[PDB]
Amino acid sequence: AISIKTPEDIEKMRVAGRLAAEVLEMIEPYVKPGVSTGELDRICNDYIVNEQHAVSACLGYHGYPKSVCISINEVVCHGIPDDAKLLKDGDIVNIDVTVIKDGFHGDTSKMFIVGKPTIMGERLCRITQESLYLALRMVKPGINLREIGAAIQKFVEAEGFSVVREYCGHGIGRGFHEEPQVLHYDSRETNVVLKPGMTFTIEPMVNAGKKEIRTMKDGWTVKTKDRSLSAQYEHTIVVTDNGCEILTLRKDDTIPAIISHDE
Ligand SMILES: COC(=O)[C@@H](CC(C)C)NC(=O)[C@H](C)NC(=O)[C@@H](O)[C@H](N)c1ccc(C)cc1
Numbered sequence: 001a002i003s004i005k006t007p008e009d010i011e012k013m014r015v016a017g018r019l020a021a022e023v024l025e026m027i028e029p030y031v032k033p034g035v036s037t038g039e040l041d042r043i044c045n046d047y048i049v050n051e052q053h054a055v056s057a058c059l060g061y062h063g064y065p066k067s068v069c070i071s072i073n074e075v076v077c078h079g080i081p082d083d084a085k086l087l088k089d090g091d092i093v094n095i096d097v098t099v100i101k102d103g104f105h106g107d108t109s110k111m112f113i114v115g116k117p118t119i120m121g122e123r124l125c126r127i128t129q130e131s132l133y134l135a136l137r138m139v140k141p142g143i144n145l146r147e148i149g150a151a152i153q154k155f156v157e158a159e160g161f162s163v164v165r166e167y168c169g170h171g172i173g174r175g176f177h178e179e180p181q182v183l184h185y186d187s188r189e190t191n192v193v194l195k196p197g198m199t200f201t202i203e204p205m206v207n208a209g210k211k212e213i214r215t216m217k218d219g220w221t222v223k224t225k226d227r228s229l230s231a232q233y234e235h236t237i238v239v240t241d242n243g244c245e246i247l248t249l250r251k252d253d254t255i256p257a258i259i260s261h262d263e
């Protein structure tokens with residue numbers, strides 16, 4: 001039950017992925033010491049609705065209260081935007097955006113480092129991005145997803161980091177979450193052979209310590225069991241005839257929008 005997108009659908013995904021990407025570009029100047037995450041969420045929502053004439057896919061989804069997720073330091077994912085929550089020097093910060101435009105979803109996140117990098121935050125963010133990028137470079141018709149999960153996990157662990165098991169990338173299109181599940185580690189269960197026009201996300205969560213996570217008493221916030229740092233990047237892609245196209249590319253990405261394995 002993997003959706004194959006038509007060229008008209010893929011074009012709608014390009015628009016929606018571009019808007020999601022542009023939310024993350026827009027917000028970047030506002031990501032500063034002493035800004036609250038509640039404020040950042042406010043800026044993002046206004047932009048999505050008022051300017052982009054889009055909607056947040058996150059708002060209301062399984063009851064999620066805000067328009068974007070903002071996750072700091074040892075928060076793994078689903079960090080809830082909040083006014084007592086102030087950014088400060090050294091923080092690593094994930095903003096994860098999903099927009100619906102013209103029926104189609106675009107889903108992307110990046111890390112921002114606030115004020116002065118700590119060495120360890122820098123390394124973790126860089127390795128996590130490189131883990132996404134290497135997975136992106138493998139995407140092409142006829143490869144299996146199992147191969148890709150296995151490659152991400154190998155790279156990350158070689159750094160003495162760990163891969164979060166509980167959250168995975170996913171098909172995306174008219175549905176926020178569609179088949180397949182894209183696991184960022186090796187599993188016998190995986191057996192999806194990629195085909196031109198599947199669209200999905202890859203979104204590895206990498207912990208500097210151990211892979212175990214815990215959910216907080218707000219019912220949303222996910223943290224490392226061990227309080228070590230955690231980082232995540234996410235891109236929405238379409239499988240093309242000889243590679244992939246990243247639908248959520250930003251100006252700060254250092255990988256090409258179109259990755260071609262063709263002679
Ligand atoms: C184990 O997988 C899950 O728990 C569910 C969470 C439910 C409550 C939405 N799925 C996810 O967390 C997925 C994997 N997350 C994402 O797709 C994020 O990329 C996406 N932007 C997002 C979706 C939904 C929420 C509440 C937050 C972020």
Ligand SMILES: [Co+2]
Pocket residue numbers: 096097098107108109234
């Ligand atoms: Co996301």
Ligand SMILES: [Co+2]
Pocket residue numbers: 107169170201203234
């Ligand atoms: Co996602």
Ligand code: NA
Pocket residue numbers: 071072073074075076077092094229230231
């Ligand atoms: Na984090």
